Amino acid sequence: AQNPHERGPDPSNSYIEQARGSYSVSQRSISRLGSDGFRDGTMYYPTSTADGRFGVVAISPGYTASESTIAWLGPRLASFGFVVVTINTDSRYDQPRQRATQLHAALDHAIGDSVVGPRIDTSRQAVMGHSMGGGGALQAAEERDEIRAAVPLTPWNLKKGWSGVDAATLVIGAENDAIAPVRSHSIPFYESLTNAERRAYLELRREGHFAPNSSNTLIAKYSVSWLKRYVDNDLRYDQFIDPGPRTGITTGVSDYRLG
């Protein structure tokens, strides 16, 4: 490809829905000191070195703070061609700003790791997170220019104005969310991402706050597509983002916007 960062097969709808993509995944534990709330976690990455370095995606855990809440994302997204760091934390670190701190640390930990560091293109970083972890993803994106993509999942944040984010951002809301209602969290965030390279809002029909903590084909396929497109500049994934899913019972999508 003209594009040096293209990894893996030409995609299809079936492909991006797979539990695992083309790449076999290895994993390596994280053990670190400090008081930021991130003392452990996991790095998932393609074993194969044949294709070049990959971007790195850090994921902030969910509402209840354990890594287990986001663990399914790690090997699944990594298998499409990413280094993926899942953070473990606890309830002392529930502020989005505290979660942002950890995301920067997780990206830096993987970059600086003797095993995984050589597999990362440090110019191509990304963040995701659930709940306040999704709020923290927005904040980390505002703070780190090397973040090329953000995918907040049912994000919670009292801060509503995201003009400071340049990273392409896909906000995934849950229609029936009673913790971070879309009307006061996700959609205001989408509406204020006025400087994001691209912004998208994808609402999960008839789901609530905790949907992102279980394997979710919608979250996975659109996360894969967004990360591919903005972390890898991979135009092969535009076909899934625009026009995107139609809404209704048959797609499980209650709202989809691009801007």
Numbering used by the authors: 26 to 284
What do the paper's sentences say?
Furthermore, its X-ray crystal structure was solved at 1.43 Å resolution, revealing conserved features of the PETase family with potential relevance for future engineering applications. The X-ray structure of PETase SM14 (UniProt ID: A0A679PDB4) validated the accuracy of the predicted AlphaFold structure, exhibiting a high structural identity with a root-mean-square deviation (RMSD) of 0.278 Å. Notably, this extends to the loop regions, where the catalytic site is located. Structural alignment of the three enzymes shows a high degree of similarity, with an RMSD of 0.691 Å across 190 Cα atoms for IsPETase and an RMSD of 0.81 Å over 195 Cα atoms for PE-H including the catalytic triad within the active site pocket. The catalytic triad of PETase SM14 (blue sticks) comprises S156, D202, and H234, while that of IsPETase (green sticks) includes S160, D206, and H237 and S171, D217, and H249 for PE-H from P. aestusnigri (pink sticks). While the catalytic residues align across all three, the catalytic pocket appears more closed in PE-H and SM14 compared to that in IsPETase. For instance, Y88 and F98 in PETase SM14 and PE-H, respectively, are positioned in such a way that the catalytic pocket appears to be more closed. Structural alignment enabled the identification of the corresponding residues of PETase SM14 and PE-H, which have a nearly identical arrangement: Y88, H155, M157, W181, I204 and F98, W170, M172, W195, and I219. In PETase SM14, however, the motif includes a histidine (H155), instead of a tryptophan (W159), which is commonly found in IsPETase and related hydrolases, ,, also in PE-H (W170). IsPETase features a highly polarized surface charge, resulting in an isoelectric point (pI) of 9.41, whereas PETase SM14 and PE-H have a theoretical pI of 6.67 and 6.54, respectively (as determined by the ExPASy, ProtParam tool), and both exhibit a less polarized and more delocalized surface charge.
In this study, a PETase-like enzyme (PETase SM14) from Streptomyces sp. SM14 was heterologously produced in Escherichia coli, and its activity was tested on post-consumer plastic substrates using high-performance liquid chromatography for product quantification as well as scanning electron microscopy and atomic force microscopy for substrate surface imaging evaluation. PETase SM14 exhibited high salt tolerance (1.5 M), good heat resistance (Tm 56.26 °C), and optimal activity at pH 9.0, highlighting its potential for PET waste bioremediation. All three enzymes share conserved motifs, including the serine hydrolase sequence Gly-x1-Ser-x2-Gly and the catalytic triad Ser-Asp-His. Due to its thermostability and activity on PCP, PETase SM14 may represent an interesting tool for enzymatic PET waste management.
